[model samples]
Structure formats: C-alpha cells, structure tokens
Target: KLSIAVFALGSFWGPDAQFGSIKGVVSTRVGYAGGTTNNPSYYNLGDHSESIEIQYDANVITYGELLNIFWNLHNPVYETTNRQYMSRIFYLDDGQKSEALEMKRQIEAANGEKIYTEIVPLENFYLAEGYHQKYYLQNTTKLYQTLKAIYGGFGNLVRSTLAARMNGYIAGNLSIASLKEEMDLVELPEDQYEKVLSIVEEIKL
Candidate 1:
C-alpha cells in the first residue's frame, strides 16, 4: 500500500514539482490543509496553507527518507508567512507525528535556532483547482501534449506516475543525467527525447 505525506511550506505548485522528482513517490498532488475553517479555496483560503500530498511506496522509500527531504528543502528558521503560506507538516499518524517532532527537536538543537515549521495532525485536505495541478507540465506545451496523449487525456494526468515525474523534470528539479536514464520509459520521439535532454542541460538539477 502507498503511504501519504503532506507538507505546506511554500506555494503548492513548487512543492508538487520538486517532490515529484524523488524516487518511490507514486504521485504528488497539491491542496489546502491544516486549517480550522468551514471551507477553503485558492481565492478565499481563510487560514489553510498551500500543501502537497505525496503518495509514496513505503517499501521503496521510507517515511524517514521523505522527512530528510522535508527538512533539507525548506527553511523553517526564517521563512514564516501568513497562515495561507504557513509552514506545517500535516502528519497522518502517530509514527509520522513522533518522527516529525523528534526531527524538529534535533534540527533546532543542532542549529541553536528555532524552526518555524509546524508539526500538526492533518485535519483535512481540500483539492486545489484543476488548473493548479501539474502546473509545470502544463507550461511546457510540447511535453504537455505528449503526456496528455500518452495518458489518454488531461483528466488522467493529475494523478499519473508518469505525469508526476515529467512535471518534476520540467520544473528543473531532476538532473539531465538522471532523466536520461529514464528516457526510455517516456517513449518520446527520437528528436523530442534529445530536445528534452538539451533543455535540461541549462536547467539546474
């Protein structure tokens, strides 16, 4: 079974794109969570922070490894924002909750600075609008068309394994060398595949 990990530290789009690059992440979807409100939307997110929910295979990647990424990629020391963009770890269970707290304490003790990230139980996760899903993939017109065709339509792309990784690569979080190893899986046309690598040459991993 796939386990879940949800976090809110930045725009959901950024979190979805970056985390989608990680191995063993089955899929990544963005939403609003950790709020104490009746209803929250992008336009009127009373107190909900933008969050990313990662569906990952626990056998391939442990939650601890995910936590390592969670700690490394975000700055909890000085990046606090309004509740709409608040930094929070919305844990799904006691295992996740305990690990998160321990990790936060260790990090703060080591750095002698406070980490502003919150470790809280996930109350609810409200799906973001359709346009917000796989945003980076949507921006790359050619890649978007290729995936939309491969997945049968735009509706299927949001939760697809291929779309998740493709979105990450498009966002420049996946390195050119690493992406080359997985090109065969994508089944892009010869010219298109090479074009992808060429573009990644200039983008950071």
Candidate 2:
C-alpha cells in the first residue's frame, strides 16, 4: 500500500478536501507532526505543525506520484516561523526519506534557491479532538450563517480563508489533554495547571 499525506498550503481543510478527491487514498487524518513534543494539543507553545496522513494503495498510485501531488499542493517558500502553518513534508520510512530528499534537491536546483520545505521522519502523531475532524464539511452552513449574522452579508473571502485556516488548525492540530500533561510536568509559572484542571473537569464524564 501507499500512503501520502499533506496539509493545505496554509489552509488545511480545503487542501485536505482536495487530496481526498484523489482515487487511491484509503484514509486521511489531519494532525500535528515534525516536532519535539509528544501528543501536543491545540493550546500551548509547541513546534508541532498542522499536517495530514494519507493511506493508499501502492499499485494504484506510486509514491512518486503521491509526492508530486503533495508538493504541488503547497508553497514551500515560508519556513522560518516554525509555526503550525509553514509548509512541510513528513516521511514514514527510509525509501520515503530518500525520495523526499532527492525531490527537495531537484526543486532547489530548478528554482535556483533552496527548498524551504522540511523533510523529516514521522515522530509521534497526536490526533486532534472530535470537534476538529471534518470541521468545514460538518459546519459550513453554520459558519456561513455566523458570518452573515456578524458581517451583514455572506462575509468577505478573506474572512472565510482565515476561518478555514484557524478551523483547520484546531481540527487537525490541537490537543487540550496533551497540553495539560505537558504543563503539569513543567511547573508553569502561573496557575496554568489549575486552569488546565478546570478545563479537564468539564470534559470528564
């Protein structure tokens, strides 16, 4: 089987939807990766970037084809911020590792500049909460209604883009539980631990 996953350039939802349109993809999950933390959540300061995981059939779609589609879907020009939105590539194995490295080299040579996209091994992946999964598909009408109510019309395209970017963000990248665990261990300067406990209290059955 072949698996290819990618996040929308800056907008995760639409990009995820776009890849979902491909025939071979068996499953696609959005989340955070390529960072140091473990099971990171939506809150807190962590290096984790929003991303997706695609599982597909190798016979139907070659790894290179998947890579091409993945690269074409995003602009690799932004890299320094180390925030959740920068373009990145996560590889699952040595073969993927080698292929991604080679592709980076080729892209840089052809463009006359270094590729800003990061190619790294897949570390632990934290699944985003249920509210985040398929957020746009689940709440498009509500979002549109919300915009109309607030902005007095269908709302501006930029607003929609921003909303999607943020929605895709929390849906795929945030994990409150993980954040709380990290906070508890670090002995945060403030009552952050108490605040985390309060949030968990509500979520607990």
Best by TM-score: 1
Each prediction's TM-score versus the true structure: 0.87, 0.62
lDDT of 1 by residue, 1-205 (tens): 6899999877878778888888889888888998887668899888899999999999899888888888887777875558887889999999999999998999899989999898899999988888899999888787677657766888787788777877888887886666666666768788766766665554543
Clashes of 2: 5
Candidate 2 colliding pairs: 2-58, 41-175, 42-174, 42-175, 132-171
RMSD of each: 3.0, 16.3
TM-score of model 1 (CA atoms): 0.87
Candidate 1 residue pairs in backbone clash? none
**Model 2: per-residue Cα lDDT over 1-205, one tens digit each:** 3455543245456565555445455456567776788878777429888777666668777677777877787657655775677777777789988988888788788888766887777777776654455555336554434433433443242223223332333344324454344335446445544643453344342
Candidate 2: stretches off by over 4 Å: 1-9, 140-205
Candidates' C-alpha lDDT: 0.83, 0.58
| C-alpha lDDT of candidate 1 relative to the true structure | 0.83
